[PDB]
Design a protein around this nucleic acid. Structure first.
Ligand SMILES: [Mg+2]
Ligand SMILES: [Mg+2]
Ligand SMILES: [Mg+2]
Ligand SMILES: [Mg+2]
Ligand SMILES: [Mg+2]
Ligand SMILES: [Mg+2]
Ligand SMILES: [Mg+2]
Ligand SMILES: [Mg+2]
Ligand SMILES: [Mg+2]
Ligand SMILES: [Mg+2]
Ligand SMILES: [Mg+2]
Ligand SMILES: [Mg+2]
Ligand SMILES: [Mg+2]
Ligand SMILES: [Mg+2]
Ligand SMILES: [Mg+2]
Ligand SMILES: [Mg+2]
Ligand SMILES: [Mg+2]
Ligand SMILES: [Mg+2]
Ligand SMILES: [Mg+2]
Ligand SMILES: [Mg+2]
Ligand SMILES: [Mg+2]
Ligand SMILES: [Mg+2]
Ligand SMILES: [Mg+2]
Ligand SMILES: [Mg+2]
Ligand SMILES: [Mg+2]
Ligand SMILES: [Mg+2]
Ligand SMILES: [Mg+2]
Ligand SMILES: [Mg+2]
Ligand SMILES: [Mg+2]
Ligand SMILES: [Mg+2]
Ligand SMILES: [Mg+2]
Ligand SMILES: [Mg+2]
Ligand SMILES: [Mg+2]
Ligand SMILES: [Mg+2]
Ligand SMILES: [Mg+2]
Ligand SMILES: [Mg+2]
Ligand SMILES: [Mg+2]
Ligand SMILES: [Mg+2]
Ligand SMILES: [Mg+2]
Ligand SMILES: [Zn+2]
Lengths: 56, 118, 159, 99, 142, 144
RNA sequence: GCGAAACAGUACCGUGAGGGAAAGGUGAAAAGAACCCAGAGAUGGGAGUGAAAUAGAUUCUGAAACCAUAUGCCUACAACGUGUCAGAGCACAUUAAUGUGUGAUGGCGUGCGUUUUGAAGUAUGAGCCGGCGAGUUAUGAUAGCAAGCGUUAGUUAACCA
RNA sequence: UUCUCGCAGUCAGACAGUGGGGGAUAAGCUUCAUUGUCAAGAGGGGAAGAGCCCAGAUCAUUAAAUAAGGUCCCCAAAAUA
RNA sequence: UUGUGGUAGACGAGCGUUGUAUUGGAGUUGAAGUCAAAGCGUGAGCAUUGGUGGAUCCAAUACAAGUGAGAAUGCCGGCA
C-alpha cells in the first residue's frame, strides 16, 4: 500500500509535533561541582561519599 | 538565429504568482496551482458581484420588514402604499432612515398610512 | 536535424511493459542530445527580384530629391588631384565645407587615384563610380559631391 | 440638516459637510454643482421630487476605483478571455441646502 | 551585536540536528553547555565544539563580558548532499542520499536583539520610499 | 459608487425573556422562538453578530400536538452503531422528556451554521414552573 | 555549437561487433590570508592584503521548487477544490492611494488539460521547480492585396564584368 | 437564405413534446418525420440534475419594474372571505 | 440607430524576444542580470524607486527569424 495523494508540508510537521526532545535531569556533584545527570556516577568516579572508580 | 527564452516566461508567471498571494501553501508557491486559483477566484468574484446586488437588496427588504412589524403594518402593503402615493424611495435609504433617524422614518409611514393617494 | 546528429538508431527502451514512456531514439527533438526539427539551412536564397524599369524609376526619384538640394555641390578635376594623396588636406576641405559630420559621397567618372588614396582612412566618407552607386548609397549620403562629367553621364543613363 | 438626493441612479442620504462618491459628472474640480433631484428635505417630502429644493455641493476629485480583472473561462473549451475595469468616480462634499 | 560560529558539511543530517538545536535556543551560557554535555545523541558532541568556539571568539575577538551571552539562534541549514547507488534485488538499483548540514550558532548579549533586526529592515524599507519621493519632486520640477 | 450601510460591530443588546408554554402548539411556539432567538424581528439585523436575545421556556410538558400525532408520529435518533435507531412516540416524548422535544424542534428551524450553535445555546428550557434563571430579572412577554 | 571548449571516443557498459556521458569563469596583480583565539585537526572568528573578503580556492552574476529562523495577525465543538463577496477586532504606515498585513463571523461555491452526446469523475495525463521541446526550407500552381511597365505589350534564364 | 470566387470544419450525437415502425402500448432501448434545448449557453425554478419551464451574460453600480416560480422557519416576500 | 454568449472554423487589428541597417541617447557619479514594494494600461504587456551586481544597453522606423511553453506514462538537472 502506498499514498495515492502526496502528503503536504503541513501534515508532515503535525506528525513531527510529538518528536520533540526532553532535557535529561542534571545535578551537581558534591565534591567537584560539574553538572552530572541525576542518579549516576560523576566523571571522577565519586558517587555520594564513596570513591567508585579512579579519577578520569 | 537561436532565440533563447529568458525573462519572458518568468515575468508572465510571476504576474500570476503575485495575484495569487495569500493562498494556502503550494496554492501560492507553484505557478500552475496559482494560475488555476486566480482563474477560479475571478469566476467567483464575477458571479458574486451579481449575487451581491441581490443579497444586499434582500437585507434592505428584511430590515424594513422587521422595522414595520413593530408598528403593526406589513411589507407587502408598504410598497403598495408607496406606489399609490407616488413616493419613490429606495429600500436602502428607507432602511437607513429606520436605523439612524427613527423619528423621520415614522413620518414617512404616517403619511403613506392614511393620507389621500395623490 | 534528427538524422544528421550522431547517435544510436536503436530503440533505447522496449516499447511496452516498462514504466517509462515510449521512446524511439536518443537524438529526438525533445531530447537533450539535440535534433533540430526544421532549423536554418545554408541553402536559403535570401534574394529578391526587381524589374529593370522599376530600378530605373527608383534611381530616378532618388536622384531627383537629392539633386537640386543642400549639400549637393558640384566638383571638378582640379581638386580631385589637388588633394596630393594626403588626407589632412581633405580633412581641412571638409572642415572648410562644413561637411564633417555628413556622410559625403564622391561620385566619380574617371577613378582618380589621388582622391582614392585619401578618403580611405575615413570610415565616414566614401567615393564610388557612377556604375557603382545604388539607391541605398545615394540616400545614406545626406550629402554628396558630384562631378560635372558624372552629371552629364547621369542624363545619358536615364534616357 | 439631511436630504435624499438622486445623483446618477442611486439615492444618497447626505448631512451637512458630508463627502459621498458618485458616478462621473463631467465637471472640473473646484466648481459648485447643483444637484437637482431631491426627494426628502428636513420634514417636507415631495411625492415625485421636491420642487426648488437644491443641494449645493463642491467637487473634490475625479479619481478611479480599484482595478477589476474579469477573466471569463470556459472549462475544457479553449476559451480564456481577460479584461480589466477601472470605473471612474467623482467625490463631492455638501456645502449648503437651498431652502 | 551577534557573535557567531559556522561549520560546513557536517555529517549529521539537518533533520536529526534541528531536534537537538531546539534544546539550546534561549539558554544561558553555562546552562547551555551543561545540557549538551550529557545528552546521548550524536549531534551533541559537534554543536558543543561549535558552541565553545563561538564563546571563545565572542569574549576574545569581539570583546564581550562572558556572563551575559545567551544562544540567540542555533540552526542546521541543509548542506550539499552526496549521491550513491545502493544495489537492490532482481537487478534494480536505488539512490542513497547522504545528507549534510551547515551548522551555525549565534549568541548575543542584549536581550532585545530582535528589535534591532526589525529596525534595519524598517530602515531598508524606509530607505526605499524617500528615493521614490525624491524622484517625484524631481519629476514635478521638470 | 454609493454610501455603505451601518453595521453593528459585535454590539450586544441581548436581553433575557420568559415565556409560558401552557397550551402552545409545538410548531407555532418554535417558529417565534427561532425568530426571537435569531433577532430577525429586530430593527437592525446584521447576520454575522448573533444580535438575538435569550429566551426561557416554562411548562414544556404542557405543550400540545394537534390531531393523532401523539400516537402516530415518531421521533428518530440513530447512534453510530447498527440498530441504534431509537424511536419514541409523541406521547412518550410529551411525558418522559418534553424539554428535548422542544429543543430539537427549535434547533431544526435554524440555518446550518457555525453561529447556530451559540443560538441554540441561548434557549433555556424547563419542564416545570420553577427555574434557576430568576437572577437575570427576565421580562415577561406573552405568546412568544 | 562537432558526441568531444577540460587529458573525449576518455570514464563507463558488453564475450564481441558495438553503445557512449557529464564537467568552463577568484582577483588588475596570489598580493592565495603571516599572526592570535577555540578545537585533535580540518575548520571557524578576528588580524592582514585588496577598491570590494557576503570577491577566500565551495572561488562572475545567483532564479524557482525545497529546508529552517523571526516582527505582526489568526487558529484546539470543527465538515473544509481552501477561494470569493460582505465583515469586527488586532498591528502598522504607502509608487497617498475611498492605504497595507491577518481574518472572529455571514452568504455562495464539486480543479486544469484531453477525449467525448454527456467528465467533480469511481475515465484519462501531469509529484514540484527550471531549461529544452512540435507548421519550416527548396522548386512550381492557384487566389487576394500592392507596385513597376503598357497596347506589335511585359519580362529575362544560364553566362560575362 | 439568389449568383461567382478564396478558406474551412462537420460524416460517433443526446434528451423533452408530438405521429408512427421494431420491441411486449418495457427500457435513460433502437430506427424515422417535426417542433425546441444541450452540444457550442451562464442566470432564476425544479432540494441537488447538459437536454424540462422562464430567458439569452459588453463591463461597473449595495438603483427600480417584472417572467417562470413562490410568500410559517430554514430562505426574499400575504393578506382578507 | 442596430448591436457586442460561444467550441470546430473564417477574417481583421496588435503585443513581446534576438539580431541587422539607419538615425539619436544613457552608462564605474554604476548597464545588463536579479530580488522587493501599497504603481500604469482593454489584453498580450509597460514603467518608478531601493538592495545585489560589475560592463554594456536604450528609443524610433524597417528588415530576417531556431520568435512566444502547463500538460506529449515528453528529455535533462535539482528538490520534495
Ligand atoms: Mg514548516
Ligand atoms: Mg513521530
Ligand atoms: Mg521556455
Ligand atoms: Mg546538438
Ligand atoms: Mg545480481
Ligand atoms: Mg571493457
Ligand atoms: Mg572570512
Ligand atoms: Mg553551492
Ligand atoms: Mg557565486
Ligand atoms: Mg474555538
Ligand atoms: Mg456541539
Ligand atoms: Mg453538510
Ligand atoms: Mg463554510
Ligand atoms: Mg467564507
Ligand atoms: Mg464545497
Ligand atoms: Mg493548451
Ligand atoms: Mg471515450
Ligand atoms: Mg473524487
Ligand atoms: Mg481505467
Ligand atoms: Mg485513453
Ligand atoms: Mg497520473
Ligand atoms: Mg516541467
Ligand atoms: Mg500573387
Ligand atoms: Mg437522429
Ligand atoms: Mg443514428
Ligand atoms: Mg422521442
Ligand atoms: Mg417509439
Ligand atoms: Mg412504438
Ligand atoms: Mg437513446
Ligand atoms: Mg463535440
Ligand atoms: Mg443553463
Ligand atoms: Mg436549480
Ligand atoms: Mg448579449
Ligand atoms: Mg407571478
Ligand atoms: Mg422571510
Ligand atoms: Mg463574440
Ligand atoms: Mg530590437
Ligand atoms: Mg538593478
Ligand atoms: Mg521554438
Ligand atoms: Zn565529581
Amino acid at each position: 500500500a502506498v499514498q495515492q495523494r502526496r502528503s503536504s508540508k503541513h501534515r508532515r510537521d503535525k506528525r513531527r509535533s510529538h518528536d520533540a526532545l526532553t532535557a535529561q535531569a542534571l545535578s551537581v556533584c558534591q565534591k567537584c561541582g560539574k553538572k552530572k545527570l541525576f542518579h549516576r556516577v560523576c566523571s571522577c568516579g565519586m558517587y555520594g561519599d564513596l570513591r567508585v572508580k579512579k579519577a578520569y | 538565429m537561436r532565440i533563447k527564452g529568458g525573462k519572458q516566461t518568468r515575468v508572465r508567471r510571476k504576474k500570476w504568482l503575485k495575484q495569487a498571494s495569500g493562498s494556502f501553501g503550494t496554492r501560492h508557491a507553484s505557478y500552475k496551482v496559482a494560475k488555476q486559483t486566480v482563474i477560479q477566484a475571478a469566476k467567483y468574484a464575477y458571479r458574486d458581484r451579481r449575487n451581491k446586488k441581490r443579497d444586499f437588496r434582500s437585507l434592505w427588504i428584511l430590515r424594513l420588514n422587521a422595522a414595520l412589524r413593530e408598528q403593526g403594518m406589513t411589507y407587502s402593503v408598504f410598497i403598495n402604499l408607496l406606489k399609490k402615493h407616488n413616493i419613490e424611495i429606495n429600500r436602502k435609504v428607507l432602511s437607513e432612515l429606520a436605523i439612524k433617524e427613527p423619528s423621520k422614518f415614522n413620518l414617512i409611514v404616517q403619511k403613506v398610512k392614511s393620507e389621500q393617494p395623490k | 536535424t534528427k538524422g544528421e546528429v550522431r547517435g544510436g538508431g536503436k530503440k533505447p527502451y522496449k516499447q511496452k511493459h516498462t514504466g517509462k514512456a515510449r521512446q524511439g531514439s536518443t537524438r529526438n527533438p525533445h531530447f537533450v542530445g539535440g535534433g533540430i526539427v526544421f532549423g536554418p539551412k545554408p541553402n536559403r536564397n535570401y534574394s529578391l527580384k526587381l524589374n529593370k524599369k522599376a530600378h530605373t524609376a527608383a534611381l530616378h526619384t532618388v536622384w531627383s530629391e537629392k539633386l537640386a538640394s543642400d549639400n549637393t555641390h558640384l566638383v571638378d578635376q582640379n581638386l580631385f588631384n589637388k588633394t596630393e594623396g594626403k588626407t589632412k588636406v581633405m580633412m581641412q576641405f571638409l572642415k572648410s565645407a562644413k561637411l564633417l559630420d555628413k556622410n559625403v559621397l564622391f561620385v566619380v567618372n574617371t577613378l582618380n587615384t589621388n582622391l582614392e588614396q585619401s578618403t580611405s582612412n575615413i570610415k565616414n566618407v566614401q567615393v564610388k563610380h557612377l556604375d557603382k552607386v545604388s539607391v541605398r548609397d545615394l540616400m545614406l549620403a545626406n550629402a554628396l559631391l558630384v562631378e560635372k562629367e558624372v552629371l552629364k553621364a547621369l542624363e545619358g543613363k536615364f534616357k | 440638516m439631511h436630504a435624499i438626493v438622486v445623483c446618477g441612479s442611486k439615492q444618497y442620504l447626505v448631512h451637512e459637510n458630508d463627502t459621498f462618491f458618485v458616478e462621473k459628472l463631467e465637471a472640473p474640480v473646484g466648481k459648485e454643482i447643483q444637484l437637482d433631484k431631491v426627494l426628502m428635505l428636513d420634514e417636507k417630502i415631495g411625492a415625485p421630487y421636491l420642487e426648488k429644493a437644491r443641494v449645493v455641493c463642491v467637487v473634490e476629485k475625479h479619481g478611479l476605483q480599484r482595478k477589476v480583472n474579469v477573466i471569463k473561462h470556459i472549462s475544457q473549451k479553449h476559451h480564456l478571455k481577460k479584461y480589466g475595469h477601472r470605473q471612474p468616480y467623482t467625490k463631492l462634499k455638501v456645502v449648503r441646502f437651498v431652502h | 551585536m551577534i557573535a557567531f560560529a559556522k561549520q560546513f558539511r557536517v555529517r549529521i543530517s539537518p533533520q536529526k540536528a534541528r531536534l537537538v538545536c531546539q534544546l539550546i535556543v534561549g539558554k544561558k551560557t553555562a546552562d547551555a553547555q551543561n545540557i549538551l554535555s550529557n545528552t546521548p545523541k550524536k549531534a551533541a558532541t559537534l554543536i558543543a565544539k561549535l558552541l565553545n568556539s563561538a564563546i571563545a571568539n565572542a569574549t576574545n575577538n569581539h570583546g564581550m563580558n562572558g556572563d551575559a551571552l545567551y544562544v540567540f539562534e542555533c540552526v542546521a541549514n541543509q548542506g550539499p548532499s552526496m549521491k550513491r547507488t545502493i544495489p537492490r534485488a532482481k537487478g534494480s538499483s536505488n539512490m542513497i542520499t547522504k545528507r549534510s548540514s551547515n551548522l551555525v550558532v549565534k549568541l548575543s548579549d542584549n536581550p532585545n536583539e530582535r528589535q534591532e533586526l526589525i529596525k534595519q529592515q524598517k530602515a531598508l524599507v524606509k530607505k526605499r520610499v524617500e528615493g521614490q519621493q525624491k524622484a517625484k519632486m524631481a519629476r514635478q520640477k521638470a | 459608487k454609493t454610501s455603505m450601510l451601518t453595521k453593528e460591530q459585535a454590539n450586544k443588546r441581548r436581553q433575557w425573556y420568559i415565556v409560558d408554554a401552557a397550551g402552545l402548539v409545538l410548531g407555532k411556539l418554535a417558529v417565534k422562538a427561532a425568530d426571537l432567538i435569531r433577532g430577525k424581528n429586530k430593527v437592525d439585523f446584521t447576520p454575522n453578530q448573533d444580535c438575538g436575545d435569550y429566551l426561557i421556556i416554562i411548562n414544556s410538558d404542557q405543550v400540545v400536538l394537534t390531531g393523532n400525532k401523539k400516537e402516530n408520529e415518531f421521533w428518530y435518533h440513530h447512534s453510530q452503531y447498527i440498530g441504534g435507531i431509537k424511536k419514541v412516540s409523541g406521547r412518550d416524548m410529551l411525558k418522559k422528556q418534553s424539554d428535548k422535544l422542544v429543543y430539537n424542534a427549535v434547533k431544526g428551524m435554524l440555518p446550518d451554521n457555525r453561529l447556530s450553535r451559540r443560538w441554540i445555546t441561548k434557549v433555556h428550557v424547563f419542564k416545570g414552573d420553577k427555574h434557576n434563571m430568576e437572577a437575570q430579572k427576565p421580562t415577561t412577554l406573552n405568546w412568544s
